[PDB]
Design an enzyme around this catalytic site. Structure first.
Site, mmCIF file in Angstrom:
data_model
loop_
_atom_site.group_PDB
_atom_site.id
_atom_site.type_symbol
_atom_site.label_atom_id
_atom_site.label_comp_id
_atom_site.label_asym_id
_atom_site.label_seq_id
_atom_site.Cartn_x
_atom_site.Cartn_y
_atom_site.Cartn_z
ATOM 1 N N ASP A 99 21.019 79.795 44.055
ATOM 2 C CA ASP A 99 20.137 80.791 43.446
ATOM 3 C C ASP A 99 19.925 81.848 44.734
ATOM 4 O OD1 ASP A 99 18.295 79.673 45.184
ATOM 5 O OD2 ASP A 99 16.876 78.827 43.723
ATOM 6 N N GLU B 16 17.644 85.387 34.520
ATOM 7 C CA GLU B 16 18.428 84.105 35.192
ATOM 8 C C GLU B 16 19.613 84.159 34.992
ATOM 9 O OE1 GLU B 16 16.787 82.431 36.999
ATOM 10 O OE2 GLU B 16 14.622 82.469 36.614
#
Ligand SMILES: [Cl-]
Ligand SMILES: [Cl-]
EC number: 3.2.1.17
Length: 162
Positions: free
Chosen positions: A20, A11
């Site tokens: 994202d 991440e």
């Protein structure tokens, strides 16, 4: 290697609001803020999560705290889920981390949905599960990360992360 280090590689850790892979407002280590297209709504959620007027920026400690909470929540989500718990209990430590990773990324509901793969993992049919897991939107949208998690379930080692 461990769950935190593993997710940290998958991440990253950004100290500003960002978008994202699906275009949603997120912050820190993959902490989803909102699916709404509004930056404002995003900032609002961030401040509410941090407990202060952040103005879209957080410190490293703040990011880490969110991260810790998110990891704890994924685990607990797994243990509370009737379809997930049994799988998780059947796995070894490295593979449990792979399952936590998927949950962290897609939510309990998303994962509970890989019915066939879950059954295969529970039966310890590694190669089979790996092929099944790859037939998914998840693998097609984020192939590198999916490959890393899949190899983890296939081999039971951290090789894809080393
Ligand atoms: Cl939160
Ligand atoms: Cl990817």
């Amino acid at each position: 290697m461990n769950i935190f280090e593993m997710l940290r590689i998958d991440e990253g850790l950004r100290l500003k609001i960002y978008k994202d892979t699906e275009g949603y407002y997120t912050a820190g280590a993959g902490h989803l803020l909102t699916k709404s297209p509004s930056l404002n709504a995003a900032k609002s959620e961030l401040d509410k999560a941090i407990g202060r007027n952040t103005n879209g920026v957080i410190t490293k400690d703040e990011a880490e705290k969110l991260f810790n909470q998110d990891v704890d929540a994924a685990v607990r989500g797994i243990l509370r889920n009737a379809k997930l718990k049994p799988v998780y209990d059947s796995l070894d430590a490295v593979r449990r981390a792979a399952l936590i990773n998927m949950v962290f990324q897609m939510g309990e509901t998303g994962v509970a949905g890989f019915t066939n793969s879950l059954r295969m993992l529970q039966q310890k049919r590694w190669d089979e599960a790996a092929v099944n897991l790859a037939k998914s939107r998840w693998y097609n949208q984020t192939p590198n990360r999916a490959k890393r998690v899949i190899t983890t379930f296939r081999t039971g080692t951290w090789d894809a992360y080393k």
